[PDB]
């Protein structure tokens, strides 16, 4: 059904639509905390070994 019943807006511009969609997702340091955790993990692992 999903394959055969796919439709969109009449005059969609993908670049514009995704521009609005992704706007709130890159407003904070969220992606960077995992980087910091990875570093601490590295130090902890080496020291433990």
């Amino acid at each position: 059904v999903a394959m055969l019943c796919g439709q969109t807006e009449t005059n969609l511009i993908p670049s514009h639509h995704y521009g609005k969609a992704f706007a709130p997702l890159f407003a904070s340091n969220a992606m960077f905390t995992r980087n910091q955790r990875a570093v601490i993990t590295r130090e902890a692992f080496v020291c433990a070994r």
Partner: protein, 1273 residues
């Protein structure tokens, strides 16, 4: 249970029957009904002695503190006002006073009393102030007590009777016995304690007794005194007790409601006190549920199809809930608690909040809790003095923060002024919108079509009406001698009567009469101020036509009237469900008082100017609806003034603007107050019926659109808000109807808008409305309120309090109704308990008890004889109430969704078939010659032994008396007829069309020998229908009543052993149920509160079928061929006849005659007749030809696909070949499917596949007989 022992023997039997112990029978049915009508009502209270209550409730003596009534009333300017006690000018309701001193004693019942004849005489004759004040107080106090469908004590008796014994379990694995039990209900204990004050020798005198003429009161001894509020408190307690049992709530919540009522009753003005703290419960529960951390659960996934104008929605799965989706708006605890502190009820809030905190996740329990707590608000129909009501509501004028400067107008055009182009702002937007619509209306040959003209004139006449006296005066004043038809016994104030008088007169002569007084009426409400009904006279209603037409065009061609087409009200159900889903943010808005805020100084002047200018495009000399063009002076140019002609439409506007500027002049004549009629004008729009919704919805949409696209972007601050506020438009973001409106935001990307921006947005909207004097009264609580429907996270919440079990509105000092009407009240009462999802098993038990009491009644001649009668219980089965237990069966196997009428009978018999046949063979000798459906076993005698036929035919009998004719009155009947026809047939072409159609029709029907006497809908009978309606609106004479009782009894006593021909044939079909259908949705997801595994049958029915009406290929038959019809005739009759003719294979000219009989011209008649075909017709469309319809109870379910591809009329491997419909299946299969699905819906439990298995006669024989019957009727 010693209480069961306390009941008299017949009632004990009835309780056993209701519990499912024994099959019900007419014998015990009468014994119970009879004994209830003979014993004094106080004994019901006496029953309460045998309940060992164990609840922590204390009734403070503070209740019995009657405040003197004399200081609660006064007369000034010769009108009896309410003089509120507190400084609040709204304390205009019934005070808390001891009625005692105003009582005499009755000769029939010496204990109770009524008003002093001396007081009413002096108030009438001497117009003495204190006499009048006492009278007014007595009248309204009695009226407030009368706002019940019947005496509350009877309802309490019902509750005790059903609750006296636990119901027997059925064999169903989901049949949970009741968890709640008596001796734990605070309400009943409260009733006990308060009633202890009203006993002198263990007699329990009722504080009041309702009668057809109002209510009487008991004279208190010298020691005691009765405060009227106590009676009201009892009703609320009884109503709450019933509701709590049916909703099956915890005693703690009921405890809170009891304390709620007690605190209100303790203070003065019980009504006012309740009204002030009304919204406390919904705010505590509905507005704030999931403002915590442990949030989660499952929620519906609803999608709105692309052509959003069509309002089509698709269920497309479920969505997991998580914290990111939890509601963003602030809770409502702080304001509510602050309010409750005023009445020192903070404990209630603490209890509610603590209990609420036990539902962190969205599931059945959470919504069930919400349903129960919200069911605690008072269900009383509040009533106040109409004089105070009219004085308090219409005394308001809107406050405009930036009025249109006088220099913004052009020179006058006789009455109106056009708007200068240089003016901008919302007013300019409003002006252009109306002007554009007026232009579109201007050139439109849709009007001047004689048929359409007939529709408009006919639309103006109804059985009700008003202002006839003003009409007769105004025209008599101008020398116009109107006709009279009094001998034709029809009310003068009926809109029909005045219309007949007007028929002959040239219209322009009547123009002076439009500036005449308009009478008014009041209709009380449950949770708000009473509504207003302001019926214009027929002439005024005719003049205002352009205003309606333009408004309609605005609606139908911009935002598609925002559902104001009202085609089926259920289209708002999926809308609010979608609006409440987690991904969407919704805001509830509504004009504070749209009727009171629309006015001429700001609004109507702009509209009048725009309409008058918008009509300039068009022939200046073109009369409209008999209004000719005229010459008016144009003064736009100070240097070159002159006069020019203007079309009739503009002339209408000229007068219409004059009327609006003058303001409406109402005349109040309230009956509850004493001798205080007067008249005063106001700018308040009439807004008495749906005819006003168009104008307010149009203006509502217009202002909202301008706000979104212009005002808000120019004024708001948040850049993010601007980014999301743009790319938004009303046609896909806003809906409304009258004042009510819904605004929903575009889906914030996987996120929600900051409450900060929301506050900024909501604040600016308030200011925007303040500009032109609209208080917007907005709120944001992540819920859906629209047309009094409530949805939370895609689950509908039935607000049961708005349908109190005991309450009923009565707008007059007298009930003015006859006994048999009570039956229809019962039927309507029961259905609400199905629409709202209550405990279906217990609700059914209570319903039957109500039916039993209603089953019996009598009447007495004004001087002479008495009369009496009562129905066999089988009537109510035919009327649509499932039986609890049949002989040989097991109790509680019939679902509430069982259809009424023949369908319900057929389904019941179909399930009951085999037992009846076998049992009849053992019990009775065989009948003398073979039967089509039965063997020789002769079940019909057994059915007669059960009195089935008696009930079946009794329900067919009419229940309102008929008025009698007269011959000199028939000269008036003809005079009434002639004029009604004259008013209907303004032109001659329509009359020629109808006459030709009728002449051809009877000629064909007889000569072709289809049949004779076929009552075919035709225009010539429309005046006859009007006349009958007009005469029916009158109070019948006693002779008609006596005829009714005699006829009813004879119909009961006459021994008949046959149903209608249709039902006889329907019994020839055998239907069986297979396995359960595949599920519609996940059973975990709640869709309607209370339709949960606890309330199994509703939970089954909804889960299997799915609620969202999703007729993707069926369209539920709304494509009727005749889109345009006149009032009075029934479309459902017309298409039924047409299809019946088509099946009968009538020649085309037969269709031509029928179509021409309702005004269709020959060309369009041929065009319409060609469209008729068995192919494009829908299942229900064709099935209705034999009166097989869909029960109203099903309107909330997605039955389309099931009927389409789940009711097998011919399964190859199961059906006997004898039942093969063959070629006639094109019109046979829908009938069988309808029968099948009706039987499937009848039984309890999950929905199963329905299959025709056998027809005793050949399918051909069945089709042949059906064709015969179709030809006969």
């Amino acid at each position: 249970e010693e209480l069961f022992n306390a009941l008299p023997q017949p009632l004990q039997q009835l309780s056993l029957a209701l519990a499912g112990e024994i099959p019900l029978t007419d014998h015990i049915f009468e014994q119970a009904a009879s004994t209830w009508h003979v014993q004094p009502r106080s004994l019901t209270y006496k029953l309460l002695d045998h309940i060992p209550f164990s609840t922590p409730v204390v009734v403070p003596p503070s209740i019995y503190h009657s405040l003197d009534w004399s200081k609660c009333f006064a007369v000034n300017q010769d009108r009896v006002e309410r003089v509120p006690t507190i400084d609040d000018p709204d304390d205009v309701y019934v005070p808390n006073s001891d009625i005692g001193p105003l009582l005499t004693s009755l000769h029939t019942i010496p204990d109770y009393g009524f008003l002093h004849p001396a007081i009413e005489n002096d108030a009438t004759t001497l117009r003495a102030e204190r006499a009048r004040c006492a009278s007014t107080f007595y009248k309204i106090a009695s009226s407030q007590a009368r706002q019940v469908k019947l005496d509350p004590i009877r309802m309490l008796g019902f509750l005790l009777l059903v609750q006296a014994r636990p119901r027997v379990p059925s064999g169903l694995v989901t049949d949970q016995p009741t968890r709640r039990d008596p001796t734990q209900s605070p309400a009943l204990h409260a009733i006990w304690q308060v009633m202890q004050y009203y006993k002198v020798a263990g007699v329990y005198y009722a504080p009041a007794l309702v009668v057809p003429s109002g209510a009487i009161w008991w004279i208190p001894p010298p020691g005691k005194r009765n405060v009227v509020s106590v009676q009201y408190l009892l009703t609320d307690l009884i109503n709450l007790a019933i509701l709590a049992h049916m909703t099956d709530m915890s005693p703690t919540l009921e405890l809170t409601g009891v304390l709620m009522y007690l605190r209100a009753a303790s203070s003065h003005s019980h009504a006012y006190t309740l009204l002030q703290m009304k919204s406390v419960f919904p705010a505590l529960s509905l507005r704030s549920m999931y403002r915590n951390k442990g949030f989660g659960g499952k929620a519906p996934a609803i999608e709105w199809t692309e052509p959003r104008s069509k309002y089509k929605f698709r269920w497309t799965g479920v969505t997991q809930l998580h914290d990111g989706l939890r509601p963003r708006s602030p809770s409502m605890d702080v304001p509510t608690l602050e309010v409750l502190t005023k009445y020192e009820l903070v404990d209630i809030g603490h209890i509610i909040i603590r209990e609420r905190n036990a539902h962190p996740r969205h599931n059945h329990d959470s919504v069930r809790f919400v349903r129960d707590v919200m069911a605690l608000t008072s269900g009383m129909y509040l009533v106040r003095q109409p004089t105070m009501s009219v004085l308090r509501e219409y005394s308001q004028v809107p406050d405009i923060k930036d009025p249109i400067p006088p220099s913004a107008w052009t020179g006058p055009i006789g009455n109106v002024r056009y708007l200068l182009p240089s003016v901008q702002g919302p007013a300019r937007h409003l002006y252009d919108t109306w002007r554009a619509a007026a232009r579109q209306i201007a050139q439109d040959p849709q009007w001047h079509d004689p048929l359409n003209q007939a529709i408009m004139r006919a639309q103006y006449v109804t059985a009700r009406g008003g202002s006839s006296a003003s009409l007769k005066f105004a025209l008599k004043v101008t020398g116009i001698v109107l006709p009279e038809y009094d001998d034709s016994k029809v009310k003068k104030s009926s809109k029909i009567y005045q219309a007949a008088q007007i028929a002959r007169i040239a219209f322009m002569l009547l123009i002076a009469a439009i500036h005449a007084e308009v009478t008014m009426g009041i209709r009380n409400q449950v949770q708000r101020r009473a509504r207003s009904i302001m019926p214009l006279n027929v002439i005024q209603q005719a003049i205002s036509a352009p205003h309606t037409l333009v408004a309609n065009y605005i609606n139908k061609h911009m935002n598609l009237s925002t559902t104001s087409g009202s085609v089926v009200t259920d289209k708002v159900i999926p809308l609010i469900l979608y609006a409440s889903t987690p991904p969407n943010t919704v805001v509830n808005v509504d004009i504070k008082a749209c009727d009171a805020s629309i006015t001429y100084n700001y609004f109507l002047s702009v509209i009048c100017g725009a309409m008058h200018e918008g009509f300039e495009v068009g022939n200046a000399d073109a009369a409209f609806m008999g209004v000719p063009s005229t010459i008016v002076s144009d003064r736009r140019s100070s240097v070159a003034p002159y006069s020019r002609p203007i079309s009739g439409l503009q002339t209408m506007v000229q007068h219409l603007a004059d009327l609006y500027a003058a303001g409406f002049r109402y005349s109040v004549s309230d009956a509850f107050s004493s001798g205080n009629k007067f008249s005063f004008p106001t700018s308040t729009f009439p807004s008495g019926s749906t005819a006003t919704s168009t104008e307010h919805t149009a203006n509502n949409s217009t202002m909202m659109e301008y706000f979104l696209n212009v005002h808000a972007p120019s004024h708001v601050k948040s850049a993010s808000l601007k980014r999301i506020l743009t790319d938004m438009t009303i046609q896909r973001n806003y809906v409304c109807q009258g004042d009510d409106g819904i605004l929903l935001l575009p889906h914030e990307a996987a996120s929600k808008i900051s409450a900060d921006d929301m506050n900024e947005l909501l604040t600016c909207l308030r200011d925007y409305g303040q500009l032109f004097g609209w208080n917007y009264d907005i709120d944001w609580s992540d819920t859906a309120e629209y047309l009094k429907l409530y949805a939370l996270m895609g689950c509908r919440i039935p607000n049961t309090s708005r349908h109190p079990p005991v309450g009923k509105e009565y707008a007059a000092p007298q009930t003015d109704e006859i006994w048999p009407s009570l039956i229809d009240i019962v039927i309507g009462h029961h259905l609400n308990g199905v629409t709202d999802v209550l405990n279906w098993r217990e609700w059914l038990r209570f319903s039957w008890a109500f039916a039993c009491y209603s089953s019996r009644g009598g009447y007495t001649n004004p001087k002479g004889q008495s009369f009496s009668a009562q129905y066999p219980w089988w009537t109510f089965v035919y009327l649509g109430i499932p039986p609890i237990l049949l002989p040989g069966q097991t109790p509680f196997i019939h679902s509430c969704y069982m259809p009424p009428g023949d369908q319900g009978m057929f389904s019941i018999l179909n399930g009951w078939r085999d037992w009846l046949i076998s049992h009849a063979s053992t019990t009775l000798p065989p009948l003398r010659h073979n039967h089509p459906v039965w063997g020789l076993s002769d079940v019909p005698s057994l059915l007669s032994q059960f009195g089935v036929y008696a009930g079946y035919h009794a329900a067919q009998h009419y229940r309102r008396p008929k008025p009698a004719p007269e011959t000199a009155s028939s000269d008036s009947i003809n005079q009434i007829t002639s004029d009604l026809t004259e008013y209907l047939f303004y032109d001659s072409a329509l009359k020629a069309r109808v006459m030709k159609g009728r002449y051809n029709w009877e000629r064909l029907s007889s000569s072709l020998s289809l049949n004779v006497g076929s009552r075919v809908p035709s225009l010539f009978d429309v005046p006859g229908k009007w006349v009958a309606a007009g005469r029916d609106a009158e109070k019948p004479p006693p002779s008609s009543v006596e005829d009714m009782f005699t006829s009813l009894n004879r119909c009961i006593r006459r021994p008949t052993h046959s149903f209608s021909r249709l039902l006889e044939l329907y019994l020839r079909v055998h239907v069986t149920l297979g396995e359960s259908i595949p599920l519609a949705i996940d059973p975990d997801v709640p869709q309607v509160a209370g339709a949960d595994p606890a309330n199994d049958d509703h939970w089954f029915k909804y889960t299997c079928l799915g609620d969202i009406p999703s007729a993707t290929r069926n369209y539920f038959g709304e494509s009727l061929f005749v889109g345009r019809v006149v009032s009075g005739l029934d479309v459902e009759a017309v298409d039924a006849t047409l299809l019946r003719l088509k099946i009968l294979g009538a020649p085309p000219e037969a269709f031509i005659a029928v179509l021409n009989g309702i005004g269709m011209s020959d060309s369009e008649a041929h065009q319409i007749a060609g469209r008729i075909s068995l192919a494009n017709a829908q299942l229900v469309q064709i099935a209705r030809v034999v009166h097989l319809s869909i029960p109203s109870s099903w309107m909330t379910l997605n039955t389309g696909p099931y009927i389409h591809h789940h009711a097998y009329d011919f399964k190859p491997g199961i059906t006997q070949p004898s039942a093969k419909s063959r070629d006639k299946s094109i019109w046979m299969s829908p009938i069988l499917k309808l029968l099948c699905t009706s039987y499937a819906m009848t039984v309890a439990g999950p929905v199963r596949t329905s299959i025709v298995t056998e027809i005793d006669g050949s399918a051909a024989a069945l089709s042949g007989n059906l064709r015969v019957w179709m030809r006969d009727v």
